[PDB]
Structure 1
Amino acid sequence: EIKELLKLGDLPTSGQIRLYDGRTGEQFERPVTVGYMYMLKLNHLVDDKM
């Protein structure tokens, strides 16, 4: 089902795309898994810990 949903859009079914290095502009030798992940910010702030 995930692969079908990926195919519905213009995205590869493998889930990995080709990425280029920002600093050097050279394409990475292997495909890298990119996507969207739900990330949370925990209540452990560095400025409150110094």
Structure 2
Amino acid sequence: EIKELLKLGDLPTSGQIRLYDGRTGEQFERPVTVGYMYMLKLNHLVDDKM
């Protein structure tokens, strides 16, 4: 089903893209996984640590 939904949009079925480098602009070989992950922010904030 995840392949099916990645195919609904025109994304690549294998879940991996080819990113290009932002500093040299040359494509990273070996295509990378890029997706949308849900990042929390645990409140071990540094400025109560330092």
TM superposition score category, shorter chain reference: over 0.9
Distance 2:40 2:17 in 1: 25
| Corresponding position of 1:33 | 33
Q: Output one character per residue of 1:2-50: Cα deviation in whole Å (capped at 9) or x when no partner.
A: 0000100010100000110000000001100000001100010111111
Count of paired positions: 50
Distance 1:29 1:7 in 2: 23
| TM-score (norm. length: structure 2) | 0.95
Q: Which runs of 4+ in 1 moved over 2 A?
A: none
**RMSD over equivalenced CA pairs, Å:** 0.5
> What percentage of aligned pairs have identical amino acids?
100
